[PDB]
Symmetry: C2
Subunit: 178 residues, 2 copies
Amino acid sequence: PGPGGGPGPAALPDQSFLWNVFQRVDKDRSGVISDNELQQALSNGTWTPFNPVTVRSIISMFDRENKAGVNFSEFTGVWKYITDWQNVFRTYDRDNSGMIDKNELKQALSGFGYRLSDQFHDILIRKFDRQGRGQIAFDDFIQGCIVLQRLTDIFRRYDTDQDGWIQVSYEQYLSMVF
Amino acid sequence: PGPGGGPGPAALPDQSFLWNVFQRVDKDRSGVISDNELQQALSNGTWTPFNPVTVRSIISMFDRENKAGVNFSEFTGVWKYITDWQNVFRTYDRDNSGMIDKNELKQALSGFGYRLSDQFHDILIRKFDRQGRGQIAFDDFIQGCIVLQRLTDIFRRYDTDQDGWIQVSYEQYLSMVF
Ligand SMILES: [Ca+2]
Ligand SMILES: [Ca+2]
Ligand SMILES: [Ca+2]
Ligand SMILES: [Ca+2]
Ligand SMILES: [Ca+2]
Ligand SMILES: [Ca+2]
Ligand SMILES: [Ca+2]
Ligand SMILES: [Ca+2]
C-alpha cells in the first residue's frame, strides 16, 4: 500500500473550430504556438499568469520536433490535454470553489490510484500551491500531478519488486533526485 | 467542413492491482510485456486473436526504450489506454451488440470531431473490418481510429491553410502514402 496506481488526466469540436482557436493563440502568426503564447491562452482562474513551468511541460509533451512550441496538429493534442484536466479538476473541486483543498486533493489522488498518507498532502500543497493559501489552483494542480507521475515512473524503474520500498546508495539518491 | 477535429480516446486502481495484472500478462517473467503476451491479455470479444497490428501500435506507443515491449510503469499507461478505448467503444456501441456498425461508426467519428461523408464509412469498415460482416470489433475499431488520426496529422502538415484541400506532386503523393 504505497505507490501510485494507474496514470491520470490524459475530442468533440471540428478542425475549423480548433484551427480558428489555433490562429488566435498564435498571435505572431509564426505558424507555431510558443510557451509564451499558450500561457496567455490558458487560465488558472486566479487572475495570475498560468504557471509557466506547467506551460513548458505541456509544450514539450506535444512538441515532437524540439521547436520550443507546437503546430496545429499537436495543438489539438494540447487542447484535448487541457480539456481532460479541466474535467478532472471540476470533478474533484467538490465545494465548487475553483480551488482544490487538501480534502479534495486526497480525493483526486485516491481517485488516480495513489495510496498516500494524510501528512503527505500538506507537503504536496505547500510544495505546489503558489498562491500560498492551501487552495491549489488549476495550473498548480496539473504540475503537482505531473511531477508525481513523473517521479512515480522513476521510482518504479528502481522498485523491481514494486513493493513500495527501495535501497539506494547516496549517489543514486542524488542521481535520481537530479 | 472536411478534416478531423480534436484527437480521440487517450486511472482508479492502485499499483498492487496493476502490478499483479502485469505479472500475469508477463508470462515468461522477463520483466517486459511483449507484443505476444499483451495480445493474449487483450480481448476483441469476437473469439479471435486481438488484431496483432493494433497490439504492435499500442506497444510502440508506450515503449520508450525501443525494446519491443513495455515495462510495469509503461504498462499502466497501456492499461489506461485500453481502458479509455473500451469506454469509447461502449459509448458508441448503442444497440449493445459488441460490434460497431456503420451508423454507430458515424456517431463515433462525428463525436471525435470528424466531418466525413456517409460513403466514406463504407470504405472505412471494409478496410478495417477483418471479421468481414460490416460489424467492427473492438480491436479493428482502435486500429481504424489510430490510422485516421495518424493520417490526419500527416495531412495537416501539408494543408498549411487547413482548408481541407492540398495540391500534391506525384511523388509527395506516394511519399506521404508511404
Ligand atoms: Ca506563434
Ligand atoms: Ca474546492
Ligand atoms: Ca461541481
Ligand atoms: Ca523493492
Ligand atoms: Ca515477458
Ligand atoms: Ca453495435
Ligand atoms: Ca450501452
Ligand atoms: Ca490548403
